Amino acid sequence: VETFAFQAEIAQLMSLIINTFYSNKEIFLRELISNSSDALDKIRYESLTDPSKLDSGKELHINLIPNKQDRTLTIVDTGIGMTKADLINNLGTIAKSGTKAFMEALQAGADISMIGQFGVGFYSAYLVAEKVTVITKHNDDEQYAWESSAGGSFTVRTDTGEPMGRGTKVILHLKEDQTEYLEERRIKEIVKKHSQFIGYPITLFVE
Template sequence: MQKGTIGVSTENIFPIIKKFLYSDHEIFLRELISNAVDATQKLKTLAAVGDYTGETGDLTIRVQLDTKNKTLTVSDFGIGMTDEEVEKYINQIAFSSAEEFLEQYKKQANAIIGHFGLGFYSAFMVSDKVEVITKSYKEGSKAVHWTCDGSPEYTLEDGERVTRGTDVILHIDSESKEFLEEDKILELLKKYCKFLPVEIAFGKEKEWKDGKEVETGKDRIINNTKPAWTRKPSELKDEDYKSFYHELYPVAEEPLFWIHLNVDYPFNLTGILYFPRIKSNIEIQKNKIQLYCNQVFVTDSVEGIVPDFLTLLHGVIDSPDIPLNVSRSYLQSDSNVKKISAHITKKV
């Protein structure tokens, strides 16, 4: 019998990432925002346990579009990285800092989204160059500037960032020009990030003045950081449930009633399922229930989670225990899925 180690050529890995890492290239924005949220949640955890004693300040994640220079930038004010951490977490593919952090702070940690260590590389699906400018929260840390053009080679040098946190700058390639359109980025942010737990700003709010739309000086915050399903049922009134329903489905009639799901054993599951008003011409709409993982939108195709006879329901299901593949786009068969499906059926 012969044993050995399978080799992976670094020269060939980036073309594979660029083409096949995710089925939808638009996923890159979800992944980068999720990383920014994780960095922010980690800082909150460190502050809560006393391992960070400085001012947290404004933690808003900012998304900036520069059509002239063809760049899209995601900036956070989270924990940042040292040069050693950049070497460890950026230069080693599929090495996730989330796993180490959760192991160390598993009792105190805010919800951490990433586990695979591949999300950052989704940036190369739409970019011909990616820059990371980061500065760690650790005292005495210097800013670091990492640059890569999608080949196995990179540069790492001193950066110019003054504040704690990270900027990820994508130089959008010629085949991905749609991601330089404001409306497209806004659409994706609202699709994937509208319920993330950290405020996300994209541009400024607009108003009509003198017959035309003009920007105000106020940040356009695209997400609701405390959606109804993340709160305790005792904190919510009927109007809160109805308001959230219309946030999900703006043109729908008021629901008949709803069920608030909140399970922490033997699996984690939260959510709200609504029973819509049934019209005479019933149409089975399978894309009404939305699946989230730690408040990140995953899919609205929930076969295997909700039994077919309950597909008329509307609402949200959120569970970090539902097994997902690296793209978080398709559910894998697992015993937890069957348990969750059985629990939902029982509750209904």
């Protein structure tokens, strides 16, 4: 298990998301589904040039899996996945400019729901989750688990859970007062409202 410090800008962003009063938390789901859709677009594109990139799985889809016993909402996709380098440095480095611009936009009158326009929508997960675990598998790398409860650090470890083949699983460990997002009716409502036209099958599991 390796422990890393967040880039200073990202720590700032996470604190803003966690501390700012903002009732429209439901937009987190849209942002995570968007991330999945982007990752699916990417593997679909790459597979046109190299069809063997789907040897790790041909199905391109998104699953939403609520678990009331564990108080987790999981977003699973069979997208391109992320390498160790992506998890630790690449995506966070890129997120620096997006974070800066976002925080500047907020100072100018924008609101937290616009986070996606700045490429850092993933962090909206902290609107509803006390901890986020990201399990991911990219064709060119091993399966890893990234994890953070904020507070300025994250961890990365090789994952010894069930093999995924290819893709990403975002496990939201929900805050005690955000359990509405485990309810079938509520998830259905949010998907229909914000994610109606995603170009991949979204299956809402039931309990």
